[PDB]
């Protein structure tokens, strides 16, 4: 029912509602995948409800009753995501021995800076793909100069940073 | 710019809204050779007639059904020309358009440079009735001019735009199957087929199973009403110069299996707020629920063929202008 | 500079093909030919200039019926719709050719030297000396390139060995192989020459933009040149 998008009717108009802590990583880590899935859906609905409440508050010009709870929920969700993801990664490592799922290949584009070109997934092979051969992954001589310039710029910035730090240190020393 | 009314609408609870727009009262119920012919018609398209190119579900209601419907119309008419001499004289139109333009209600303009200005909000029903039978003599009355029937019309608690209903500005159009220079200005049996969008299977798939009948009802309310309006216009009559006669017309929407039967009673064109204030009149519509003309076809044999449906059709056809 | 030439139709057809205008611009997009453009819209009728080509899986001399004689917007001469056997085609119309008429196409290099009629095509070897001809090929099987304009004609001057000598519409003369085809008579729409344009508007319609205002001085070239005719050119 749509009553799931709102909390307990008792809690409407309290200014403060009791919500005890977020799911920590270790606890989450120790629950099972089936359990975890179930937990996710429980979390989700709660999150939705919180969002709705927030929206209502905004509409009303009134402050939230217990906004920290939403944050906690979010944190919990994040933790859950991390745990499951970690597990998946581990599994992948065990099976194929691959870091990440979605593959790439460290490709040097037009502008010469090396992109992690994440692969896009589709039906025909590359050599008879019209829109992918026009995507060029090589520099040509004019780019090198620009790269050099960029590098120089970067170096300048670095120098500025370093010198500034030193100056600050000196100032501090002088003070104390 | 006017609210573009669609008789065969996907909108839910469209009926009440439609009624409000029109100002109707809807009510339940009405105010062997033939059978064989019907069976033959059913068969022809579904079996006997060999298709060249392959038939598809998107292509089903166009290719199979409309022609069958047409056949039913024409053959039936031929049969009943002895039974009724008016249908011999009466013209018949396949897919010819029907347009009608009314004004129902006021609206203070919400925003812009025209804000806080009275705007009489406009409607238009356009239509292509699968086919229709147009007579020169006007049909009878059904129910008397100014019949009370105290059942009450829907509210319209919110804006017309809240229902899926959209405004546009294109040429205004009040028009029957033909133009003014014509003897055959009246009519008595509009046939519709619902599109592929409002197949009952689709409805079932969606949670809207209560809106199966509703759609048909809405359609009946719309197209018929429009036709009536057109007829009225062609014999003078406005909002202000209200109809003296009761303009009547009948119709039978359908689907390949499922038919239902709808007569319309047009007592008013006085839908503007200027006229409504002193208005005891209201337009009427009576109709049956969608009963299947038949169950199913296996090869070249209908499983169960319903004669009751056929009888209704015959009745609709067979009524005369007094 | 986008420029796909419209001439991309590989298959022969009778149907008239949509013609893109050039304006006198090249594929580079610059004007190479001044004073062109802005005329009436036109469609191309594909003209079969290889007069003796046989219909598919046949070899002998090809008879033809004239179905129609029409105006071609693409050119000065008027054109004829020929039919024969299974196939139809457009040819350039000879003078006086009308619908219903029957035409002959031949490959037959006769030692008899058979006389011919104003519509029909023959090898030059079969044609009597002194007959007027049009749509003359340069080589055998090459296709008819010469004497195609409204009202024009060349005349067969003599035969020497396996070659014939033609006088072109410019009286400059041309030696052509005996077996090369031509069609007897003069090109149709004779008196095209006598047409008076009447107004600038007509000229514009024809797709000819006006001359430039810049006053040029006349130079060395501009005196009249009385010369002998250039030496008869051969293709053997």
């Amino acid at each position: 029912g749509l009553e799931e998008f709102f909390d307990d009717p008792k809690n409407w108009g309290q200014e403060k509602v009791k919500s005890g802590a977020a799911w920590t990583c270790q606890q989450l880590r120790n629950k099972s995948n089936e359990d975890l899935h179930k937990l996710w859906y429980v979390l989700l609905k709660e999150r939705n409800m919180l969002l709705t409440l927030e929206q209502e508050a905004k509409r009303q010009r009134l402050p939230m009753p217990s906004p920290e709870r939403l944050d906690k929920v979010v944190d919990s969700m994040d933790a859950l995501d991390k745990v499951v993801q970690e597990r998946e990664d581990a599994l992948r490592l065990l099976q194929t021995g691959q870091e990440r799922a979605r593959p790439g290949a460290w490709r040097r584009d037009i502008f010469g800076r090396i992109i992690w070109h994440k692969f896009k997934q589709w039906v025909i092979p590359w050599h008879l793909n019209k829109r992918y051969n026009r995507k060029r992954f090589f520099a040509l001589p004019y780019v090198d100069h620009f790269l050099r310039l960029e590098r120089e710029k970067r170096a300048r910035i670095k120098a500025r940073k370093e010198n500034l730090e030193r100056k600050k240190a000196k100032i501090l020393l002088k003070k104390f | 710019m006017k609210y573009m009314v669609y008789p065969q609408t996907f909108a839910l609870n469209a009926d009440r809204w439609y009624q409000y727009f029109t100002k109707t009262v809807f009510l339940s119920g009405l105010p062997a050779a033939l059978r064989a012919v019907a069976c033959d018609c059913l068969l022809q398209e579904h079996f006997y007639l060999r298709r060249r190119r392959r038939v598809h579900r998107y292509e089903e209601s166009e290719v199979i059904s409309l022609p069958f419907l047409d056949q039913l119309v024409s053959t039936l008419v031929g049969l009943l020309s002895p039974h009724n001499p008016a249908l011999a004289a009466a013209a018949l139109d396949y897919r010819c358009p029907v347009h009608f333009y009314w004004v129902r209600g006021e609206e203070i303009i919400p925003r812009g440079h025209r804000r806080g200005r009275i705007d009489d909000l406009r409607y238009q029903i356009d239509d292509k009735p699968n086919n229709q039978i147009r007579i020169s003599k006007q049909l009878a009355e059904f129910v008397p001019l100014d019949y009370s029937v105290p059942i009450e019309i829907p509210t319209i608690k919110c804006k017309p735009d809240k229902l899926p209903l959209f405004k546009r500005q294109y040429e205004n159009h009040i028009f029957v199957g033909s133009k003014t220079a014509d003897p055959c200005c009246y009519g008595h049996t509009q046939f519709h087929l619902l599109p592929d969008k409002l197949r009952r299977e689709r409805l079932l798939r969606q949670n809207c199973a209560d809106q199966i009948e509703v759609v048909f009802r809405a359609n009946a309310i719309a197209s018929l009403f429009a036709w009536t309006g057109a007829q009225a216009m062609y014999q003078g009559f406005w909002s202000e110069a209200d109809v003296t006669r009761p303009f009547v017309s009948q119709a039978v929407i359908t689907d390949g299996k499922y038919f239902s039967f709808f007569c319309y009673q047009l007592n008013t064109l006085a839908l503007t707020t200027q006229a409504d204030q002193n208005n005891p009149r209201k337009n009427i519509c009576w109709g049956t629920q969608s009963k299947p003309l038949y169950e199913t076809i296996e090869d070249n044999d209908v499983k169960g063929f319903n004669d009751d449906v056929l009888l209704q059709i015959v009745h609709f056809l067979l009524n005369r202008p007094k | 500079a986008n420029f796909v030439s419209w001439k991309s139709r590989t298959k022969y057809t009778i149907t008239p093909v949509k013609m893109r205008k050039s304006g006198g611009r090249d594929h580079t997009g610059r004007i190479r030919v001044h004073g062109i453009g802005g005329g009436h819209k036109q469609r191309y009728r594909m003209i079969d200039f290889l007069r003796f080509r046989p219909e598919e899986t046949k070899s002998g001399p090809f008879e033809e019926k004239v179905i129609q004689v029409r105006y071609d917007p693409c050119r000065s001469a008027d054109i004829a719709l020929v039919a024969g056997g299974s196939r139809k085609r457009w040819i350039i119309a000879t003078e006086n050719m009308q619908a219903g008429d029957t035409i002959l196409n031949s490959n037959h290099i006769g030692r008899m030297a058979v006389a011919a009629r104003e519509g029909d095509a023959h090898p030059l070897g079969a044609l009597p000396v002194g007959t007027l001809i049009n749509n003359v090929e340069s080589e055998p099987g090459r296709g008819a390139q010469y004497i195609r304009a409204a009202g024009t004609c060349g005349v067969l001057l003599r035969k020497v060995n396996g070659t014939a000598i033609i006088q072109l519409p410019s009286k400059r003369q041309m030696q052509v192989l005996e077996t090369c085809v031509a069609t007897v008579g003069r090109v149709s729409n004779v008196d095209h020459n006598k047409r008076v344009i009447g107004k600038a508007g007509r000229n514009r319609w024809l797709g000819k933009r006006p001359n430039s205002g810049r006053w040029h001085r006349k130079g060395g070239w501009a005196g009249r040149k009385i010369r002998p005719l250039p030496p008869m050119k051969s293709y053997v």
């Binding site: - | 020309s81 010819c96 | 991309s8 296709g143």
Partner: protein, 376 residues
């Protein structure tokens, strides 16, 4: 000469890298990577084919290997096929005789106009919302109206109840001639079907008479000329219905000629020819259905009618089909060519002339009525 032009023919592939000629080393190419590179040689990949079979990117086999490709070229007729000539060509194809007037029986079966006028008016002005309806609208409409009017005599004639006009009605018929194979395909027009067959117009003596006059030759415009030359044709003939369909007997082919442009429409002779062909084809199909597939001179010659097209002009045709063995006696069609109700309709008035039709002649209408009646 070679039409095509070099630039617009697909670009010639760039020359194969010179390393490939050297036997025998591994050419280092950009197929190791998955992008193009200008240094690094061009790789040569094998011709890819797809494992699964998507209909939305389906590539068919060549005309060499198709499941029913024949070597003898068939020649097939259509609604679109519009033949150079003419009535004569059609006759030749069909093997038949053209008589200048409709038969006497039909005429007799005739022996009022306001209705016709109304119908005409309705088609040419009244039916649509916009002013002046176009031909793709009115031409079929007029015909339909006429048909309806004819039907309105069911009160007069009780036998008219046992018919049905149908719209899609595709069909086929295949035969040899000189001998070259020859085919007809179905309609894009209406078809009046009846339970009883039509009666014979000509006697068996008359048919014997036809033998004397030779079918016209007309060189060099040979048949088959304009018809669609075709391989992969399939020789099986076909009526428009499965077995057991009531109202199976083709009374009149109500085909029509819409097309708002002058070019897309038929020219009248061509139209007539087409009609004749249709008549033959349906008749032939009927004959096939009736008798064996083996050819002969017929005992009962089947009759089919076909009205001509267009809102203005009307070509009537009744076809007798008496010989399923072509290549002796021949068939005998008769036509009333280009008879026409009403010359020109003024949808708007003029500045003097009214807004109705003009030059209305009811003879055409009468003829139509007669045609409709034939069986009863």
């Amino acid at each position: 000469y070679e039409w095509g032009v070099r630039s617009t023919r697909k670009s010639e592939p760039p020359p194969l890298d010179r390393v490939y000629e050297i036997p025998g080393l591994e050419p280092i190419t950009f197929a190791g990577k998955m992008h193009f590179v200008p240094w690094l040689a061009r790789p040569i990949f094998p011709p890819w084919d797809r494992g699964y079979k998507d209909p939305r990117f389906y590539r068919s086999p060549p005309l060499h290997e198709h499941p029913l490709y024949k070597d003898q070229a068939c020649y097939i007729f259509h609604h679109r096929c519009r033949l150079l000539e003419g009535v004569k060509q059609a006759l030749w194809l069909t093997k038949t005789k053209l008589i200048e007037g409709l038969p006497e029986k039909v005429l007799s079966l005739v022996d009022q106009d306001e209705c016709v006028l109304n119908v005409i008016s309705h088609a040419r002005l009244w039916q649509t919302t916009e002013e002046i309806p176009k031909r793709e609208t009115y031409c079929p409409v007029i015909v339909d109206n006429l048909i309806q009017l004819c039907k309105s005599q069911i009160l007069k004639h009780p036998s008219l109840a046992r018919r049905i006009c149908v719209q899609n009605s595709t069909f086929s018929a295949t035969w040899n001639r000189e001998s070259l194979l020859l085919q007809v395909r179905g309609s894009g027009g209406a078809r009046l079907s009846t339970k009883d067959p039509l009666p014979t117009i000509a006697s068996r003596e008359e048919i014997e008479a036809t033998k004397n006059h030779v079918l016209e030759t007309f060189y060099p415009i040979s048949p088959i000329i304009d018809l669609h030359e075709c391989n992969i044709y399939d020789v099986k003939n076909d009526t428009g219905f499965q077995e057991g369909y009531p109202y199976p007997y083709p009374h009149t082919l109500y085909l029509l000629d819409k097309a708002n442009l002058r070019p897309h429409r038929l020219q009248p002779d061509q139209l007539r020819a087409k009609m004749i062909l249709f008549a033959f084809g349906s008749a032939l199909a009927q004959a096939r259905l009736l008798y064996g597939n083996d050819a002969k001179v017929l005992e009962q010659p089947v009759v089919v009618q076909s009205v001509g097209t267009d809102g203005r002009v009307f070509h009537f045709l009744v076809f007798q089909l008496n010989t399923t063995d072509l290549d002796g006696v021949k068939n005998l069609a008769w036509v009333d060519s280009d008879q026409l109700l009403y010359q020109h309709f003024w949808c708007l008035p003029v500045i003097v002339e009214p807004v109705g039709p003009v030059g209305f002649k009811p003879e055409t209408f009468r003829k139509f009525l007669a045609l409709y009646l034939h069986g009863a």
